[PDB]
Each structure stands twice: as structure tokens, then as C-alpha cells.
């Protein structure tokens with residue numbers, strides 16, 4: 001009884017869209033880029049990272065110093081070579097974010113550093129997109145107001 | 158606010174926070190935004206290829222003035238035709 | 242509101258209930274079941290206070306035997322016997338199952354499971370003073386214990402040593 | 404009455420006042436800060452993050468505060484904490500010159 005949501009809660013379109021875009025899509029995508037950078041990419045280069053050691057193991061030697069100094073190109077330097085043997089250090093790189101394109105020659109699959117960067121980039125777009133609609137602070141759009149205004153003036157619609 | 162309108166011209170209230178802004182402000186700012194934005198795109202991408210070490214944040218930010226200029230010129234027309 | 246003296250407090254927070262300083266800038270209380278939130282805050286208060294006391298004491302003092310002689314609190318987890326943990330879990334479990342009905346009934350008052358062995362809150366006016374102070378010490382302990390844990394993770398030193 | 408361009412007609416004056424008093428206060432603390440470029444780099448990044456993390460929250464709460472002002476439940480620039488304004492305006496012009 002005391003936890004059944006009201007009908008008004010279920011028809012709060014603007015809040016739901018803000019949260020689903022920025023949170024459900026955006027933050028989930030950002031967290032996945034986190035997984036890839038902290039775990040998947042090290043493991044691909046032969047390094048164990050788990051719950052036991054992940055707080056002490058930097059994804060990149062430079063840490064977050066380049067991030068807060070806006071020297072973001074540091075994270076692209078030194079990709080996996082074309083002779084990288086997956087799950088080993090042989091031919092392994094240090095880059096955590098790249099835009100190589102195409103396939104890892106051994107695994108015949110998209111580069112993990114490209115996939116991490118994909119997810120980081122769309123996370124930003126989704127988080128920005130989820131500030132469009134008006135909730136409790138007057139800024140933003142009403143869905144009803146957008147819809148009512150979209151009539152072609154020539155009258156064909 | 159009911160934003161439904163009839164005839165050939167929307168009624169200024171569609172511009173939201175920018176409803177009281179004059180027509181000339183929108184029209185001039187739209188030209189400036191288009192030219193600066195076009196310049197940013199040109200400098201970033203077209204004058205020599207883009208590289209990992211030649212990404213200027215200002216040109217990336219400046220490129221957003223191109224879609225923004227579109228909005229500004231629509232708002233300008235709306236105000237022009239409403240008398241504002 | 243009081244805590245944020247330039248903003249107004251939400252509608253639910255009138256300034257009657259214990260712990261009310263009108264501090265809800267997001268207006269969470271408008272959507273959330275407040276009675277349950279109060280019970281949840283008081284529960285976190287009580288767990289944190291025990292945890293805060295536990296953290297500082299078991300640094301200094303120790304139960305007999307080599308197993309219970311670890312000054313670092315987070316290092317003590319893996320040393321202590323599993324069968325020991327199972328008994329604590331089963332104990333906590335039994336308490337939570339016993340109290341479950343009361344929590345979702347909302348008949349009694351948040352945090353109230355009729356536990357006053359010594360009869361310290363005899364007067365209603367004393368109860369009020371105790372109820373506010375429970376939340377105050379609890380809120381303080383909630384920050385502190387998170388302070389302690391994060392500090393250990395970062396440094397690797399028990400609260401007193403660091 | 405100094406508004407040649409006419410921003411007070413376009414945008415609400417209450418909002419502009421909040422913006423003015425904010426510039427005034429930030430500028431003055433900076434003017435005093437400058438007196439009392441390298442320090443941007445020298446100071447650790449962890450410390451700088453904490454400054455940003457506290458300006459944020461204060462500014463997030465200011466969004467809720469601006470709502471109260473524009474609804475008419477708060478004086479522009481009041482956080483319950485002409486001389487301010489005049490000295491502030493001077494400090495703002497001064498702060499540019501130092502930067």
C-alpha cells in the first residue's frame with residue numbers, strides 16, 4: 001500500500017526520459033568503458049586485474065594526471081602492435097583509448113581500445129542528451145510544448 | 158502555455174528564454190556563429206588532416222556554433238515577422 | 242529550512258519529527274515514503290555507531306587467541322573464522338526477520354522495536370532528547386566510519402596509527 | 404539606471420543580479436588571492452579537484468536558490484551568511500588587469 005506509485009508518477013515523461021538517457025544509457029555506457037579500461041584491456045595484455053588488486057592497479061602508467069591537465073592524447077600513445085598475441089604481453093601496448101579502425105589481426109575482431117573509446121564517447125552524448133527535458137528546475141523542454149508547435153506553416157501536415 | 162499556432166508565423170513564445178530578444182540580435186548573431194563555426198570546422202579538419210595530437214578544444218566547441226546558427230536564424234525570422 | 246537557510250524545506254518536512262533540520266534540497270521526501278526512510282536512516286545510524294566503536298576498539302584491545310589479534314580492521318575479515326562469521330550473519334538474519342513485520346507495518350514509530358531494557362527513556366520528554374541525539378550521533382558516525390574505511394584503503398594504516 | 408544594450412528587458416533583473424553579485428564575490432576573493440599562474444600548476448591535482456568538487460554542489464544548490472529568487476522567496480544573492488556592489492564592480496575590472 002505505502003509503496004504503490006501514483007498515476008502521476010507513471011506519467012512523468014520528462015523525468016523518465018532524463019534518467020533513462022543520462023543514467024540508464026549514458027552512465028551504463030560510461031561504467032562499461034570503465035570495465036574495459038580497468039579489466040578487459042589489461043587482461044588482454046596478460047595482466048590480472050580483479051577485485052583483489054584493482055584499487056592499486058592503474059589502467060595507464062600516467063594515471064589521471066593527463067586527464068585533469070587536458071593532455072588526453074597521452075591515452076592513445078602506444079597501441080597494441082599488429083603482432084599482439086591476445087591474453088599475452090607479446091606485442092602489447094599501453095594505450096587505453098584509440099581510433100585505429102578495423103580488426104586485430106590475430107583475433108579478427110574490433111580493437112578493445114576502440115571499443116572502450118566508443119563507449120566513453122557515446123556516454124558523454126547520452127548524458128548531455130538527458131538534460132533536455134524540464135523536471136524540477138524550470139530549464140529544459142516540455143514534450144507537450146514541442147509537439148503542439150510542430151505544424152508546417154504551409155499547411156500540408 | 159499552449160504552443161499551438163495557425164497561419165504562416167509562430168508567436169515568439171515558442172522561443173522560450175529567447176522570446177523577448179530582438180530580431181536584429183538573432184540575425185547578426187546567426188551570421189557570426191555560422192562564419193566562426195565554419196572556420197573552426199575548416200581549421201580543425203580541412204586545413205590539413207586531423208591527428209591525435211592536433212585536436213584543439215576551441216575548434217571542437219566552435220563547431221557547435223554551426224547547428225546553433227541554424228536555430229538563431231529561425232528565431233530571427235520568427236521575431237522579424239512578429240514585428241520584434 | 243534551517244540547514245540551508247536560504248532555501249525552503251519540502252512539504253513533508255515540517256520540523257516536528259526528530260532529526261528535522263529541513264535538509265532535503267533534492268526534495269527526495271516528496272516521492273519517497275518518509276516513514277520508511279526514517280527507519281532506514283535510524284538503522285544506518287545504529288549500524289554505523291557500532292561499526293565506529295568497533296573500528297577504534299579492536300585496534301587497541303583484542304579477544305584472546307592469535308586469530309583475533311589483527312590491528313587492521315579490514316585485514317581482520319579474512320583472519321577471523323568463517324564459522325564465526327556465519328553465526329554473526331545468522332544472528333543479524335534472525336533479528337531482521339523478527340523485525341520485518343514491524344518495519345513494513347508502520348504502526349510503532351521508525352526504529353522502534355520496543356527495546357529499552359534498562360528503561361532509560363521513561364519520560365516522553367527524555368525520549369525526545371534521546372531520539373534526536375541518536376540520529377545526531379548516528380549521522381556523525383555514518384560519515385566517520387566511511388572516513389575510516391576509505392582511509393585504510395588509501396593508506397593501509399589503522400585509524401590510530403595514521 | 405545603466406543599461407544601454409538592454410539585458411534587463413531581455414533577461415530577468417533578479418537573475419542578472421545573482422550573476423553580478425557572483426562575479427563581484429569571485430573577483431574580490433581573486434583580487435585578494437592574487438595579492439596574497441605558476442600556482443595553477445604547482446598545486447597538486449587532488450587538491451584542485453576538491454576545490455572544483457566544492458564549487459560544484461554550491462553551484463548545484465544555487466540552481467535551487469535561483470528558483471526561489473525568480474519565484475520571489477529570496478533576495479538575489481542571499482545565502483543567509485551597495486558597498487559590496489561598488490567594491491565588487493571595481494574588483495572585477497581590477498581582476499582582469501591582473502590576469
Ligand code: CLA
Pocket residue numbers: 009010012015016017019020023024025028
Ligand atoms: C538512473 C536512474 C534510473 C535507472 C538506471 C532506471 C532503470 C530502469 N527503469 Mg526507470 N525510472 C526512473 C529512473 C531510472 N530507471 C525514474 C526517475 C522514473 C520515474 C520518472 C522511472 C520510471 C520507470 C518505469 C515506470 C519503469 C522503469 C523501468 C526501468 C527498467 C527498464 C528495463 C531495463 O532493464 O532496461 C535495460 C536497458 C538498457 C540497459 C539500455 C540498453 C539497451 C539499448 C537498446 C542499447 C544497446 C544495448 C547494448 C549494445 C548492450 C549489449 C549487451 C551485451 C549482451 C553485449 C530499468 C531497470 C521499467 C521496469 O522494468 O521497471 C521494473 C518500468 O516499467 N523506470
Ligand code: CLA
Pocket residue numbers: 128141145146147149150160167170171172173221224225227228229231232
Ligand atoms: C525544417 C525543420 C524545422 C523547423 C523550421 C523547426 C521550427 C521550430 N522548431 Mg523544431 N525541430 C526540428 C525541426 C524543425 N523545427 C527537428 C528535426 C528537431 C529534433 C527532433 C526539432 C526539435 C525542436 C525542439 C526541442 C524545439 C523546437 C522548436 C521549434 C520552433 C522554435 C525554433 C527555435 O526556438 O529556434 C531557436 C533555437 C536555438 C537558438 C537553439 C539552437 C538549436 C540547438 C540548441 C543546437 C544543438 C546544440 C547541441 C547539440 C546541444 C548543446 C550541447 C552542449 C553545449 C550542452 C520552430 C517553430 C521549439 C518549440 O517548439 O517551442 C515550443 C523547441 O523547443 N524544435
